[PDB]
Design an enzyme around this catalytic site. Structure first.
Site, PDB file in Angstrom:
ATOM      1  N   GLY A 114     129.941  43.700  -1.398  1.00 48.48           N
ATOM      2  CA  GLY A 114     129.039  43.889  -0.420  1.00 48.48           C
ATOM      3  C   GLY A 114     129.346  44.177   1.261  1.00 48.48           C
ATOM      4  O   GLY A 114     128.863  44.897   1.809  1.00 48.48           O
ATOM      5  N   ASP A 124     134.860  35.089   2.605  1.00 50.29           N
ATOM      6  CA  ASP A 124     133.835  35.857   2.296  1.00 50.29           C
ATOM      7  C   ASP A 124     133.834  37.244   1.834  1.00 50.29           C
ATOM      8  O   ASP A 124     133.051  38.247   1.871  1.00 50.29           O
ATOM      9  CB  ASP A 124     132.599  35.994   3.154  1.00 50.29           C
ATOM     10  CG  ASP A 124     131.141  35.847   2.265  1.00 50.29           C
ATOM     11  OD1 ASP A 124     130.976  35.725   1.061  1.00 50.29           O
ATOM     12  OD2 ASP A 124     130.157  36.505   2.996  1.00 50.29           O
ATOM     13  N   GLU A 173     131.878  50.449  14.190  1.00 49.22           N
ATOM     14  CA  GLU A 173     132.164  51.437  13.576  1.00 49.22           C
ATOM     15  C   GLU A 173     131.404  52.047  12.261  1.00 49.22           C
ATOM     16  O   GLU A 173     130.922  51.117  11.736  1.00 49.22           O
ATOM     17  CB  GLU A 173     133.684  51.360  12.837  1.00 49.22           C
ATOM     18  CG  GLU A 173     134.390  52.795  12.268  1.00 49.22           C
ATOM     19  CD  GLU A 173     135.578  52.527  11.493  1.00 49.22           C
ATOM     20  OE1 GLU A 173     136.008  51.339  11.304  1.00 49.22           O
ATOM     21  OE2 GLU A 173     136.244  53.562  11.286  1.00 49.22           O
ATOM     22  N   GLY A 199     120.652  39.975   6.066  1.00 48.10           N
ATOM     23  CA  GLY A 199     120.275  38.586   6.176  1.00 48.10           C
ATOM     24  C   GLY A 199     119.267  38.475   7.553  1.00 48.10           C
ATOM     25  O   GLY A 199     118.200  38.252   7.215  1.00 48.10           O
ATOM     26  N   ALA A 219     120.256  40.234  10.633  1.00 51.11           N
ATOM     27  CA  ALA A 219     120.607  41.332  11.271  1.00 51.11           C
ATOM     28  C   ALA A 219     119.847  42.588  10.803  1.00 51.11           C
ATOM     29  O   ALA A 219     119.674  42.624   9.559  1.00 51.11           O
ATOM     30  CB  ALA A 219     122.068  41.482  11.674  1.00 51.11           C
ATOM     31  N   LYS A 220     119.566  43.551  11.581  1.00 49.35           N
ATOM     32  CA  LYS A 220     119.080  44.618  11.597  1.00 49.35           C
ATOM     33  C   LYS A 220     119.957  45.756  12.055  1.00 49.35           C
ATOM     34  O   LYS A 220     119.932  45.916  13.224  1.00 49.35           O
ATOM     35  CB  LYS A 220     117.483  44.695  11.851  1.00 49.35           C
ATOM     36  CG  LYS A 220     116.498  44.002  11.084  1.00 49.35           C
ATOM     37  CD  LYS A 220     115.140  44.075  11.600  1.00 49.35           C
ATOM     38  CE  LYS A 220     114.232  43.119  10.958  1.00 49.35           C
ATOM     39  NZ  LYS A 220     112.779  43.127  11.540  1.00 49.35           N
TER      40      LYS A 220
END
Length: 260
Positions: free
Chosen positions: A139, A135, A90, A25, A27-28
């Protein structure tokens, strides 16, 4: 540009940003290595170009940091500079159950048992600690090198002091998708998808194990009161009857298992 070495005022540890892992979204994510201990983590990098939204992620970090379970993505700390906010997590090198689903479609019944059992055990931990994920999807059911399920992405999660049964609903969608090969409600049009959810319109095929389909119908029940609790999920006939492997090979990412 994101720095090569990520440093913290707190722990004062040096994290070398390495192999790119993917974008989520806003974030990378990168594979980061502690330059001192040489332990490998997953560094979530979120820019201050985003973040109303700054309060949303602060709640995510608050909920995530307290969690400690073999079926939940381990939180190892967070820090920030003037440009980016960094979250140390993690490492799950085998993507998520969504990538498995796309490559495999309908999985074998023993595989779904394995994946569901591990996921529910994670959701049980969350619910016992009064955390609702809200959620749950393929995914954010991540996989490590050992094919262990790790629940992540608590950006929509809440903590109590709708309720817990929305997570049970989501698990019903996951179980359906794993066994059928397609989501029970999801279509190209989002508006039609929402209508199907509201009307509780879905169909589990006749050939699917009656024991499995019965469980799906209860998990996806219109009346959230008649949905099974996370505790009675584990003790369902679906898990206690058929073959339930304790381990899965990494071959399950692409092909059905032989069990050898």
């Amino acid at each position: 540009e994101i720095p090569d070495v990520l440093v913290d005022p707190r722990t004062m540890k040096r994290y070398m940003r390495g192999r790119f892992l993917g974008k989520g979204g806003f974030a990378k994510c990168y594979e980061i290595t502690d330059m001192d201990t040489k332990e490998v983590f997953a560094g979530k990098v979120v820019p201050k170009s985003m973040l109303h939204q700054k309060e949303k992620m602060s709640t995510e970090i608050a909920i995530h940091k307290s969690l400690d379970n073999p079926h939940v993505v381990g939180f190892h700390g967070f820090f920030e500079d003037d440009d980016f906010v960094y979250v140390v997590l993690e490492i799950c090198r085998r993507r998520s159950l969504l990538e498995l689903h796309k490559r495999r479609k309908a999985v074998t019944e023993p595989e779904a048992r394995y994946f569901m059992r591990q996921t529910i055990q994670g959701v049980q931990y969350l619910h016992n600690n009064r955390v609702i994920h809200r959620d749950l999807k393929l995914g954010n059911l991540f996989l490590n090198d050992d094919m262990d399920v790790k629940i992540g992405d608590f950006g929509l999660a809440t903590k109590i002091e709708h309720s817990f049964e929305v997570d049970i609903w989501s698990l019903g969608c996951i179980l359906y998708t794993l066994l059928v090969g397609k989501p029970p409600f999801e279509t190209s049009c989002l508006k039609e998808t929402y209508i199907r959810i509201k009307k509780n319109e879905y169909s589990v095929p006749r050939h699917i194990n009656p024991v499995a389909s019965a469980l799906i119908r209860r998990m996806l029940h219109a009346d959230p009161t008649l949905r099974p609790s996370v505790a009675e999920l584990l003790t369902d006939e679906f898990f206690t009857s058929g073959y339930a492997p304790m381990r899965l090979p990494t071959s399950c990412l692409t092909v059905p298992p032989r069990f050898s």
